[PDB]
Design a protein around this ligand. Structure first.
Ligand SMILES: CC(C)(COP(=O)(O)OP(=O)(O)OC[C@H]1O[C@@H](n2cnc3c(N)ncnc32)[C@H](O)[C@@H]1OP(=O)(O)O)[C@@H](O)C(=O)NCCC(=O)NCCS
Ligand SMILES: CC(C)(COP(=O)(O)OP(=O)(O)OC[C@H]1O[C@@H](n2cnc3c(N)ncnc32)[C@H](O)[C@@H]1OP(=O)(O)O)[C@@H](O)C(=O)NCCC(=O)NCCS
Ligand SMILES: CC(C)(COP(=O)(O)OP(=O)(O)OC[C@H]1O[C@@H](n2cnc3c(N)ncnc32)[C@H](O)[C@@H]1OP(=O)(O)O)[C@@H](O)C(=O)NCCC(=O)NCCS
Ligand SMILES: CC(C)(COP(=O)(O)OP(=O)(O)OC[C@H]1O[C@@H](n2cnc3c(N)ncnc32)[C@H](O)[C@@H]1OP(=O)(O)O)[C@@H](O)C(=O)NCCC(=O)NCCS
Ligand SMILES: [Cl-]
Ligand SMILES: [Cl-]
Ligand SMILES: [Cl-]
Lengths: 382, 389, 386, 388
């Protein structure tokens, strides 16, 4: 049977070395899982399998998704799998659980994503120490943010796209400022009340994303470009930040929803993956969103809300340009530039956000790129 | 049956290929897991006799991804010369990882979302790094943890080694040091026999290392030493040794999976049909019993009985895991791991679940049912039933 | 456990029918095939699709003699459907209208067709008499009534369908009393539905006939006075409490879920499951009990999960036997009347009752239609509204 | 074959009797009991394994209630067997096989009997219900009215045949060269034992039994009279005669069908797999060329080409029909109706479609592809592709 999102919940997003930095990604995962099952109004026993996206798994201990599940009090008998599709991971987890549900292999799943960038370690190779020194690599840079083929940062890939599509620093800064503004408005206006579950840190109660407050509008046009010396557009204010957080969605068949007498928030309509040249990852979401629209036969103007994950302001701007969509329909309550971006979580966060912000009958399209030249996109309706 | 809509056509396996399994810091140690990945994948596409442009999506198991670089499955794919258009996803269900990637690729084909994929598994234990926490260096020093021990082999909840959980199951089920040792030299024998016999000529593809045609581990044996080795995970009254536990290894395995329409459209004849599969989970410490339940589940549905299976591949994470499965299932030990397995062939941990499925593919004669099962740390297991031709 | 999932269900997009005319009554001038044309044309209309999207037609039709060549082809071409649409006439005696929907469904499930019309037709007014070919025997020649010979006589017991019913009344102790009360309940339920306008959805006026003729032909005072026509002495079955001989056609547009999407059409109902059962020829009245049981068993549904039962009223006796053995709520059975009051054009009835559930069920409700047939068979269909 | 793929496990028939001839004393339902009972014996399965039966039967008037149920119960099959009688006029016996194959494919049954039966000898005359009109009434012949008259054009099938002769230009002579080509092919086949697995003799019992063992019709020729006969469906300019048209006949045919899985469970070796099938329809008057479209449909469906077909059975409703088919398909005439057809063997309407499939089943060599097609009244055709 058809896939329904029964609930969608997430921790706040904390800053790098910030308010959630004491919590492992797996704990953040448990908090969001518990909060999700709670909001669904179903027995914890009902959840049969779990997929969690988690990009930087080194040092987290054996089977991270199993840790998240068992630390949320879900049954011992729940199978668990950790998904890695770089920034798309959180979305890919929901896609893969939707497939399992559709197949009939499960009736009720949890799916989402978790990341604690604050706790990602450094690595030293196993082997004989080279004469003249030993390297100690940062796993965030090495596995998170470095393109393998070009050997440049993701920010430098963004720059390649900014040049190719003539998106200037001016338009990127305006967008970054716009995300902060939309993020502040949305929080003041309690738009995240239903989405976010507060986290009490026991050494301290965190109930709000901390990143959007870390802004000074006048500094923005003054910042040096980080990924490129001259003719650079991408800066620390206009690029997403490194963050900690977790998201969880309770998914089930329409039939399981009827059986358990629960009222689905949204139905999953369609989803797709696309891949392009590794360097071109910013536009991969264009092709993934297009595949979803073609497949179900809708056109751009039929969707009420777009969530093009804000990896860089440049990315959203590239998508709006190529898809010729109404920029006032995109990332309307902020996004990763001002909310932050715990890599394995963001794909799930953006689906969870559509689930809550869309009005009855409306179509929401979530898209997200990933290191390697990839993207996922998902179409939901309420 | 009463007017229910028929089930669609099944997913087929049209090629199974792998690298040989290298020893820890042995023959294949200079190769990253994603390179071994690209070799096994390239090899599967070649054996399928299809254009590489036909593979639509790839899933690889890979448990210890630390230091491998961004998107390890995508590295393996683009390194195998597949198109920049191929979506890629790396999967971690700790030892069940390689099997779970085939289960999940299967589900995608059954939904009609793809018509052809590669699914497999890859591990280079030789190249798994050590880690240091981010933050301030504590006064008095720090111990850089080994990721094999810390993310691979340590149970989180009980704070003990996989080998020590196996010990807790040996005690419960009366599985003595003696049986474990016999099963072990048994495995080493079968591996030897099977390589002599030419059994691995279709699956194993050779690797050329520049600055290996055969598995290396099965030749790493001393039958006289076995009964007088120290019990390495338990002090006194132990049963598990370095000889009857599996080793740390490097290796990749990949399979081409297809719908029956894609098999028709490219006029390839499948090697095997995937029948059923299931995941089970129990108490973390009891991971060695979990594979019995997954395999029960796969037999319950489809309505077969254990005597219907020609070949069992129960991963030898420990000789005791295999033995404890045999005990509870009451199956014919002469039908289990008949060309050997992990204890003697090696256990490159993300690769194994894919290796055993791919081996059943090559070994079952026409009409035969093969059951593959595999435990994973955490309390889990994955099980798959295939049928030859 | 990793079993390949089941395909998409077959959906019912429209379901229409002519009024049911009385024997030699108001539709008696029209051949069964003309009735089929009318039902089919209206079904296509109600569905909202081009005629040319219909790929194939199966129509039940029991008494084919005299209708001319390929009756279903006649109905189909008489409705203006393409000359390229293949036509087959089905005969499973009183199950034929339902067996035609079942078979069309199987074709849909196989991917052999994407859109079909299925239903049934009968003009019992125009059923001929027959005379054997060969030599006239000395002393007189018999002209047999095909209604009697091919329609209503059990081959094996050489008795009327009505006498088989008597066998069950006896076996299960269903008295003339229960049967007459049931028949009167069908007449009142019929009239009530017609006046409510409960058939405004399914019935296509024939143009002059707008409404089922049979439900008005009743006299309540005469009911306990009637003769037991199938067994003199101790009988229970009478003309009031047995179904009547009638004229009518019913048609449904069946589609795959893809074809409904492609055609931008919203399905009335899903076909969930269906089966045929058979018992000893004389025992046909209980056969629907077994067919419906197998349908419920297969979908792991329980008898209480069913909102509305349509158990064809061949005889008041059949419905009562089914109610007794299924142990189901009489108030959920044949709620808007049935064949005793509405009439029974034998090839049409199994289609009509499916069509009726599709309009009468409320969203998400399950309905179960069952119908006995001559020779000891029965068919049953489970559908779900929306 | 494997799983739900459909296989033919046996195929048998009665002899075909002549109109008012060898088998004329048996009702079509009895012929059907004989063929069903025979096909099950040859299947080598218990009769309780057959779960459902479909029988083609075109002229059902006066046969009594539920003719397929009569055929089934008369073969001694259990009373739990559902039965349905199928009418697609001369495609009926093939459509029964196609419909049974869909049930099997769907998983709703695992083992079925499908075939067809017809006793044209016993088809009655009909009299309208109601008031007898002053001045009398012609009692119509059901064979003519329901079997052989096109509703729309209001003419005999034979006259629809003359339409396609004048059009494809099929002269009389090509036509009854074909008819003697058929009588010859049948005689050889019979003499050479070629129907020995396929046909099972009928013991007609009365009140001193008589055993009918051979198709009765193929002896009734005279290669010398053929070019001399009156064109019976058209005075001026005709081409179809009694010699070059099929005759009216009695016979029945049954096939045991099952899934490849059921064959494996029951430990029996199937004869052929049903690869694919189709129906097509054109203008009623043009029925003789409908099998052209139905045959191409199955070939197209399956990616096979006309030359990969080892044997064709194009039912011989008229010599005209096979020639039009040979013509439009551009097919080798030596691969068509190789052992004779309905012109010389006879044509029990509801049976012929099952006969031609049953025939391919026996005559094909291993791995070979057979294609059966058959036209029907109202402008339809059915076609089935089989592999041995
Ligand atoms: C860009 C990045 C390198 C930040 O590093 P950094 O330059 O050291 O960050 P800083 O906080 O020091 O930023 C530099 C300056 O910008 C300022 N700043 C950052 N965001 C600002 C904002 N929103 N408004 C005003 N000032 C801001 C800082 O105050 C700092 O100013 P200072 O020099 O006077 O102190 C890092 O966040 C990154 O790698 N982001 C990309 C994440 C990514 O690629 N995600 C994956 C998606 S594919
Ligand atoms: C067992 C393990 C801890 C290795 O530790 P180790 O004892 O230091 O390994 P060694 O090779 O040094 O073994 C010690 C002795 O056993 C001997 N041994 C190893 N293989 C042998 C063979 N097959 N025949 C006879 N003796 C053998 C060695 O020769 C050595 O002898 P020595 O001490 O006299 O020189 C390690 O391989 C491990 O953690 N395995 C488990 C992996 C696992 O659980 N996989 C995941 C599934 S849950
Ligand atoms: C029952 C059947 C034999 C008709 O019987 P009939 O006696 O020939 O028909 P009649 O109309 O003359 O009915 C006899 C009497 O019943 C009366 N009547 C019939 N139905 C009545 C009712 N609904 N209420 C009051 N009176 C009724 C008539 O007025 C007539 O009365 P009268 O002659 O004493 O004045 C015939 O319709 C039949 O065989 N139906 C059964 C259908 C069947 O077998 N089912 C399908 C196969 S399972
Ligand atoms: C044609 C039909 C009406 C037969 O009627 P008929 O012509 O009076 O039958 P007959 O037996 O008298 O045949 C006429 C002559 O042909 C002769 N004959 C029959 N077959 C012959 C042959 N193969 N070779 C030589 N002579 C033959 C007869 O001896 C007879 O000659 P006669 O008058 O000198 O004695 C009848 O068979 C029919 O309607 N067939 C049509 C089949 C059909 O349409 N089937 C449905 C498919 S769409
Ligand atoms: Cl698990
Ligand atoms: Cl029946
Ligand atoms: Cl037709």
């Amino acid at each position: 049977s058809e896939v329904v999102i029964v609930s969608a919940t997430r921790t706040p997003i904390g800053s790098f070395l910030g308010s959630l930095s004491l919590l492992p990604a797996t704990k953040l995962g448990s908090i969001a899982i518990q909060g999700a099952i709670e909001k669904a109004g179903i027995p914890k026993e009902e959840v049969k399998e779990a997929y969690m996206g988690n990009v930087l798994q080194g040092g987290e201990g054996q089977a991270p998704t199993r840790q998240a599940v068992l630390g949320a009090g879900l049954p011992i008998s729940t199978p668990c799998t950790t998904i890695n599709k770089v920034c798309a991971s959180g979305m890919k987890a929901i896609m893969m659980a939707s497939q399992s549900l559709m197949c009939g292999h499960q009736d009720v799943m949890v799916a989402g994503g978790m990341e604690s960038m604050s706790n990602v370690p450094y690595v030293m190779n196993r082997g004989s120490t080279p004469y003249g020194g030993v390297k100690l690599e940062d796993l965030i840079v090495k596995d998170g943010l470095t393109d393998v083929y070009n050997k440049i940062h993701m920010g430098s890939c963004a720059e390649n796209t900014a040049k190719k599509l003539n998106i200037a620093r001016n338009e990127q800064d305006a967008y970054a400022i716009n995300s902060y503004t939309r993020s502040k408005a949305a929080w003041e206006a309690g738009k995240f009340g239903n989405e976010v579950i507060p986290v009490t840190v026991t050494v301290v109660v965190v109930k709000e994303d901390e990143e959007y407050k870390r802004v000074d509008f006048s500094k923005v046009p003054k910042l040096k470009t980080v990924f490129q010396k001259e003719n650079g557009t991408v800066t620390a204010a206009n690029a997403s930040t490194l963050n900690d957080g977790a998201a969880a969605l309770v998914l089930m068949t329409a039939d399981a929803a009827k059986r358990l007498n629960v009222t689905p928030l949204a139905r999953i309509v369609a989803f797709a993956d696309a891949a392009v040249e590794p360097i071109d990852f910013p536009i991969a979401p264009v092709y993934a969103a297009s595949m979803v629209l073609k497949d179900v036969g809708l056109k751009k103007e039929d969707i009420a809300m777009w969530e093009v994950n804000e990896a860089f302001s440049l990315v959203v701007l590239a998508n709006i340009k190529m898809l010729e969509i109404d920029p006032q329909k995109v990332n309307i309550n902020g996004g990763a530039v001002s909310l932050g971006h715990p890599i394995g979580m963001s794909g799930a966060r953006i689906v969870g956000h559509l689930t809550h912000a869309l009005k009855q009958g409306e179509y929401g399209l979530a898209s997200i790129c990933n290191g390697g030249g990839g993207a996922s996109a998902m179409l939901i309706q309420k």
